[PDB]
Design a protein around this motif. Structure first.
Motif, short mmCIF file in Angstrom:
data_model
loop_
_atom_site.label_atom_id
_atom_site.label_comp_id
_atom_site.label_asym_id
_atom_site.label_seq_id
_atom_site.Cartn_x
_atom_site.Cartn_y
_atom_site.Cartn_z
N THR A 46 -1.94 -22.63 -18.89
CA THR A 46 -2.03 -21.58 -19.91
C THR A 46 -0.64 -20.95 -19.92
OG1 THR A 46 -4.41 -21.44 -19.69
CG2 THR A 46 -3.39 -19.57 -20.70
N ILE A 47 -0.03 -20.85 -21.09
CA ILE A 47 1.31 -20.22 -21.27
C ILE A 47 1.16 -18.99 -22.16
CG2 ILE A 47 3.68 -20.56 -22.01
CD1 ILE A 47 3.09 -23.65 -21.59
N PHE A 48 1.40 -17.81 -21.60
CA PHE A 48 1.28 -16.51 -22.30
C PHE A 48 2.66 -16.14 -22.78
CE2 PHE A 48 -2.43 -16.57 -19.48
CZ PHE A 48 -3.44 -16.12 -20.31
N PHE A 49 2.89 -16.15 -24.09
CA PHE A 49 4.11 -15.62 -24.73
C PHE A 49 3.93 -14.11 -24.87
CE2 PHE A 49 4.29 -20.09 -25.59
CZ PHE A 49 5.62 -20.37 -25.36
N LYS A 50 4.76 -13.35 -24.15
CA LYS A 50 4.67 -11.87 -24.12
C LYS A 50 4.70 -11.34 -25.56
CE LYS A 50 5.47 -8.45 -20.84
NZ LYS A 50 5.42 -7.11 -21.47
N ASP A 51 3.71 -10.53 -25.92
CA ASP A 51 3.59 -9.82 -27.23
C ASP A 51 3.35 -10.84 -28.34
OD1 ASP A 51 3.98 -7.19 -26.10
OD2 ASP A 51 6.11 -7.69 -25.93
N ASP A 52 2.78 -12.00 -28.00
CA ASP A 52 2.57 -13.10 -28.96
C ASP A 52 1.44 -13.99 -28.44
OD1 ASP A 52 2.99 -14.74 -31.16
OD2 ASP A 52 5.17 -14.67 -31.00
N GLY A 53 1.34 -15.22 -28.93
CA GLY A 53 0.20 -16.12 -28.68
C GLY A 53 0.25 -16.83 -27.33
N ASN A 54 -0.73 -17.70 -27.08
CA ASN A 54 -0.75 -18.49 -25.82
C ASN A 54 -0.90 -19.97 -26.16
OD1 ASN A 54 -3.90 -19.07 -25.15
ND2 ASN A 54 -3.61 -17.05 -26.10
#
Length: 236
Positions: free
Chosen positions: A101-109
Motif C-alpha cells: 500500500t503506497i500512501f501519497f501524502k494529501d492525495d490517493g493511495n
C-alpha cells in the motif's frame, strides 16, 4: 557460489551471471486503465538492474517516478557474510508475492500485488495496481513530479508468522516547484512455494536509481538503472 550452506548455494546458483527480466503491470488509477511492459537484465553480483518500460496503452496517466518501486529485490547484492539473510533469492524459483500500500501524502493511495518468479531462464514480475482517492488537480494526476529519483535505504524485518518479510519506508518525489511529494510504503513479501526460505535478521538495502529516456523512442517510456546492496550486519 561455493558456500558452506547448500540452501545459500541453491539461491546464489540461480543468480550467477546476467538474468533476463520481463515486467508486466495492469493498472487502474481513478478509472484510467493502463498497461506497462518492461524488459532488461539483472546482475545480482553487482546489484545492478537495467530496464526499459513502455506504456502499451498510450500515455501513462501517472508520472513514471511514482511506479519505480512497483516495477525486483532478488537482484540485490548481499555481501558474502550476509547471504544467509537473502529471503528474495531463497524463495526462487517458485517465487514470492510482493504486496504494498503506497500512501501519497494529501492525495490517493496505490494498492499493488506482484508475483516474482522464473518462467524458464526469465525472471518475471507480474503486477496488479489499483489507485484510488487521487485529486485531479494534485501532483500525481496533474503530472507535477520531476523526472528524477534519489538514494534510499529500506529496513527489512522478518515476519516469522507469515514465513516472509515486511518493510515500512518513505519515498520523497521532487515537485517541479522545489517542494517534495511524500509516498509512505507498506510492504509484505510471502513465499509462493511450501519449501523452506531464509528468514533474515533486521538489515537494510541501499538503493540508487537513475531515470533516463531513449532518444529514438516515440512511445511513452522510462529507462531505469538501479543499484541495490544489502548492509547493516558487520563482519569484523
Amino acid at each position: 557460489h561455493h558456500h558452506t550452506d547448500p540452501m545459500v548455494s541453491k539461491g546464489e546458483e540461480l543468480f550467477t551471471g546476467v538474468v533476463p527480466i520481463l515486467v508486466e503491470l495492469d493498472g487502474d488509477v481513478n478509472g484510467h486503465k493502463f498497461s506497462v511492459s518492461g524488459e532488461g537484465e539483472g546482475d545480482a553480483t553487482y546489484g545492478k538492474l537495467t530496464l526499459k518500460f513502455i506504456c502499451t496503452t498510450g500515455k501513462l496517466p501517472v508520472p513514471w517516478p511514482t511506479l519505480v518501486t512497483t516495477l525486483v529485490l532478488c537482484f540485490s547484492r548481499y555481501p558474502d557474510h550476509m547471504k544467509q539473510h537473502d529471503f528474495f533469492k531463497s524463495a526462487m524459483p517458485e517465487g514470492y508475492v510482493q504486496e504494498r500500500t503506497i500512501f501519497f501524502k494529501d492525495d490517493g493511495n496505490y494498492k499493488t500485488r506482484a508475483e516474482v518468479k522464473f518462467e524458464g531462464d526469465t525472471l518475471v514480475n507480474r503486477i496488479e495496481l489499483k489507485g484510488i482517492d487521487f485529486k485531479e488537480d494534485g501532483n500525481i494526476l496533474g503530472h507535477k513530479l520531476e523526472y528524477n529519483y534519489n538514494s534510499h535505504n529500506l529496513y527489512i524485518m522478518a515476519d516469522k508468522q507469515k514465513n516472509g518479510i515486511k518493510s515500512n519506508f518513505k519515498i520523497r518525489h521532487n515537485i517541479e516547484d522545489g517542494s517534495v511529494q511524500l509516498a509512505d510504503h507498506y510492504q509484505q513479501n510471502t513465499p509462493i512455494g511450501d519449501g523452506p526460505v531464509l528468514l533474515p535478521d533486521n538489515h537494510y538495502l541501499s538503493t540508487q536509481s537513475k531515470l533516463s529516456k531513449d532518444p529514438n523512442e516515440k512511445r511513452d517510456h522510462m529507462v531505469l538503472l538501479e543499484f541495490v546492496t544489502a548492509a547493516g550486519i558487520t563482519l569484523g
